[PDB]
């Protein structure tokens with residue numbers, strides 16, 4: 001029934017991933033560094049804002 | 062036009078940046094925008110009698126970048142509501158200087174829906190019973206939420222008119238997810254259960270356990286496999302999922318295309334494996350959160366009905382119904398206890414993500430037909446293939462690429478939920494994909510330079 | 511239609527933050 005379409009999809013996916021341009025180290029390191037920088041920026045800004053505003057919230061409330 | 066012309070030129074509007082803002086200044090303005098969003102996220106509302114109730118919209122706090130009891134109780138709700146209502150009006154063709162009118166109408170409709178949402182939130186029972194607060198306190202809370210929604214809209218236009226990068230929705234969602242992860246990794250809050258002072262932050266807890274406890278092996282075990290507070294296995298899983306999603310997000314099928322009208326414009330057309338960038342995650346997360354919220358409301362109001370019970374049974378986590386099989390398992394012990402639930406959840410995640418990707422490529426104009434139309438418009442034929450085989454290669458690549466990208470992103474979300482990583486699969490995937498979108502903007506700007 | 515820039519938006523956000531803080535302080539002081 002639906003086994004043949006599923007096998008067709010699986011084979012097409014395998015052919016695609018094989019034909020794809022897998023990242024190398026020189027690109028993976030750059031992308032990981034950029035993602036780490038962005039995550040650090042947003043997360044640490046939020047962390048420091050929360051740290052600052054905890055005592056402020058205690059004083060005002 | 063109509064009679065709405067006078068009212069669409071009353072709210073503040075962000076002027077064009079005139080010049081072209083450099084990437085450093087765009088990054089600085091994005092940082093300022095997210096700083097304002099976070100600061101307002103940490104400021105509680107005025108007039109709240111009690112926050113001891115159960116959050117009716119707890120499941121829409123990640124997808125809406127909201128925070129209960131604060132100025133960003135609604136989060137990015139004004140932007141989403143304005144966009145949805147304007148898309149509904151444009152599709153049904155009632156409402157289609159035109160750009161200024163469209164922006165004014167979207168602002169007005171978003172603010173009206175923001176007022177309605179504030180009224181709904183007040184009436185949901187949070188902040189205390191709306192009768193003891195009084196009409197004055199209810200109106201004050203509504204006014205505060207109105208001004209907060211106006212500020213959110215202003216920040217969104219600040220980001221979208223060229224002063225900053227990306228949009229308000231993605232920036233705020235990613236910022237909230239990253240803040241949650243960094244808090245769970247570095248919070249100094251200490252919870253005492255008789256054993257002693259224990260920091261909530263996993264790394265700070267590790268350092269404190271190593272410093273204070275005389276048995277270093279026991280401290281290491283209780284800081285790595287901790288269950289009462291976030292532990293180090295959660296952080297390792299989060300970093301691992303970050304790494305795997307980063308690796309799979311760089312996958313791309315590079316089609317070598319050449320122009321035929323303007324000769325010499327040889328370039329590359331990359332078809333990413335994640336063809337729909339976190340679109341399946343957005344759709345699935347929004348659907349699950351909304352279904353959870355209406356299921357909670359129906360259970361609270363209509364407890365006992367078979368239709369309500371089959372939709373989902375709540376204790377604030379599902380314990381049965383259609384909303385229980387849509388929930389990630391809390392621990393691997395739950396997977397061992399109920400394997401049917403785990404199988405159904407995995408199947409739902411993979412199938413929903415693949416179907417959402419395959420539907421979105423057609424909906425958003427990413428199907429091979431539209432890409433072939435663009436290639437004909439620019440004469441961008443493939444170097445190896447002929448001019449009459451563009452559609453064939455596009456059908457070979459793009460549909461399979463989108464389906465497998467949805468499948469892989471769903472599998473990554475399932476893996477992150479099963480490993481118990483900080484921020485869950487939805488939050489991790491959304492944050493990393495949004496950061497990759499910003500990195501793509503950065504590399505595009507560098508390529509332009 | 512008022513066409514403000516990014517600095518006016520930041521100023522408006524800070525003013526709203528200050529207004530909320532003053533509302534909280536006024537409530538705390540009228541309680542005491």
Ligand SMILES: CC(=C\C=C\C(C)=C\[C@H](O)[C@@H](O)C[C@H](C)O)/C=C(C)/C=C/C(=O)O[C@H]1CCCC(=O)O[C@@H]([C@@H](C)C/C(C)=C/[C@@H](C)[C@H](O)C[C@@H](C)O)C/C=C(\C)C[C@@H]1C
Pocket residue numbers: 121124125138141142145174177178181182228230231234337338339340342343344346347350351354355491495498
């Ligand atoms: C992940 C994400 C966005 C991220 C976007 C990204 C990353 C974009 C990038 O730019 C892009 O370029 C990236 C590319 C692709 O790579 C998610 C989104 C948008 C979610 C929207 C959502 O859930 O939007 C609902 C709620 C809206 C707010 C609300 O709440 O609006 C009530 C309100 C008016 C009334 C109300 C409060 C009712 C109660 C009963 C409950 O709320 C019941 C609701 C939940 O049914 C009415 C309810 C409505 C309209 C339902 C809507 C669908």
